[PDB]
Amino acid sequence: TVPWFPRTIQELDRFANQILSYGAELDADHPGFKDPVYRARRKQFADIAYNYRHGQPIPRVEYMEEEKKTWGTVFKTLKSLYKTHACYEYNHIFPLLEKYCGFHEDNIPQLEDVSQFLQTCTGFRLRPVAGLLSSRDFLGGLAFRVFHCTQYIRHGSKPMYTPEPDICHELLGHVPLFSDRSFAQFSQEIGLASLGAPDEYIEKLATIYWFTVEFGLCKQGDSIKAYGAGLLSSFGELQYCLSEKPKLLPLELEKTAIQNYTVTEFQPLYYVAESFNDAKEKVRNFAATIPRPFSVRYDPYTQRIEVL
Amino acid sequence: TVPWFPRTIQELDRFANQILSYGAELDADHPGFKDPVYRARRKQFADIAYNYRHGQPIPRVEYMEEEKKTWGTVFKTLKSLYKTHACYEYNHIFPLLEKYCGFHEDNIPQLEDVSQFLQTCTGFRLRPVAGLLSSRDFLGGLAFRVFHCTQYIRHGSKPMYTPEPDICHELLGHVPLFSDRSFAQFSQEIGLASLGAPDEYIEKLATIYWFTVEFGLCKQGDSIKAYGAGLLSSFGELQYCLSEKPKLLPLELEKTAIQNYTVTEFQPLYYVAESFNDAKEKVRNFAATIPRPFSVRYDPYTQRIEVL
Ligand SMILES: [Fe+3]
Ligand SMILES: [Fe+3]
């Protein structure tokens, strides 16, 4: 029996009661494990995500001096690499983020302001997320152009390191690409392909997502640039991915879908997309091979999924 | 008159003439009921188990392409959840299983290689089992650190579903925990407690086994993780058990022993163990309340049970 999936954008509210309740900050090797203030601050962000409901403005939060310092360190260090490593779409929108969303070393941007900006560019919007969503729920939100976003920041003891996404990764890595119209369409196809798909295919789409949205490389002119969020928020891997060390392969979904990857070291290989439009087309073709007893359409006018 | 129980490890050979001779694959709603090739393949595995005798290497089998495909689908889909849901002991040993036992998407590990690896870690060993062993015989083997293991695989028509243990469940669910020394001691106490126990107590130990070895949750740091084999080999219940939905209760054997459970839907509640050593201690105390006119000791040097 087809697995449940949201049919309207409000139904995404059901995901809150389906996350992993025991977060990473509870593990003994998390950088802030022994810090009780950090632990409490993380619970505070989780309660905000838990009570959030579609349609409400995302709560603004006053970040502490220590958290602002961590953000500033990450921002300054990564910014130096963008003009030469990041793709054209990233660099084209960044100045607008500095100007209208407050992306600066001394200030952590508030998610509501960022969500409104994204809405104006492509209709994408953010919602705060407690802990880890299953792959199915996470990809499902993309169908409605909704991105589940963390609002907390990594522990300040290791500013250049995080074992989980945190706000620096969401804002410096994902956000700028969601402002591009073709990228937005591309990431929404992944979402649409996932609706009602069997569990084994969700894992394939999750693997495609990892090799594009998180760790993708794309052709630009006769050069190669990074557009993956995990690359764009990682100082070391960003420099590494455009050196001679990694193996580069053209994006071919049949192969990409079953490629193994490690989450703990730099990637041994990356897939290169010709463009986001082309990647979008490939996802759509791949989606036609997923055994679903139906077809889906998103109606942006009413924010509902039509089932055919 | 005290029910019979094996006194040496070879006597486990008597169990073969005591299984349920009419297996689940003979029921009309088994996924492979109408598949005559599957039916024959299942008989083939049953004959291997039937003729196996203690001391012989377990026969190697060449799995068909179709069976390998089913294993690959299950393995890929479950692997994605281990680093975040499975307990530390599971994750610590998995890489060694990939490296020395051939745990990979394209290959089904052979039981003899797995048994030799287990022997090296904790002295546990496997033996192939035909059909369903009574609870008494099944728990009795644990006293000798022997685990009765299925060698056949579920029908390929429903790779994410099985109404019975099959090889995916044994290898991805049980095996990794049997490589941990404390878990091995803990599961052996359950076995020792069962020897010569009255039928009504065997059912209590069977219920304790179900809520620990099959569906147990354990404390780790300040977090909670899965160690039950039924959870670790079930994609859906693994995500569900660490969400906010189930009721969690501390492991208390007096209560756990009489708790009812359903075998057909996700568990409404789970018992949380403090650690395997602590669970081991509780089984031992509980075992002292079982009315037996004697006491038992396992002598690992001669592989015999001493009766005191
Ligand atoms: Fe990310
Ligand atoms: Fe089992």
Swiss-Prot record, chains A, B:
Reported impact of residue 114 to I: In PAH deficiency
Result when mutating residue 101 to G: In PAH deficiency; severe
GO CC list: cytosol
Impact upon substituting residue 53 to H: In PAH deficiency; severe
Substitution effect: residue 264 to M: In PAH deficiency
Record annotation: effect of changing residue 161 to C: In PAH deficiency; severe
Impact reported for residue 167 to N: In PAH deficiency; severe
Lineage top rank: taxon: Eukaryota
Effect of residue 229 to T: In PAH deficiency; severe
Effect of residue 58 to T: In PAH deficiency; severe
Binding site for Fe cation: 169, 174, 214
UniProt keyword terms in alphabetical order: Allosteric enzyme, Disease variant, Iron, Metal-binding, Monooxygenase, Oxidoreductase, Phenylalanine catabolism, Phenylketonuria, Phosphoprotein
Task performed by this protein: Catalyzes the hydroxylation of L-phenylalanine to L-tyrosine.
Protein name: Phenylalanine-4-hydroxylase
Annotated gene: PAH
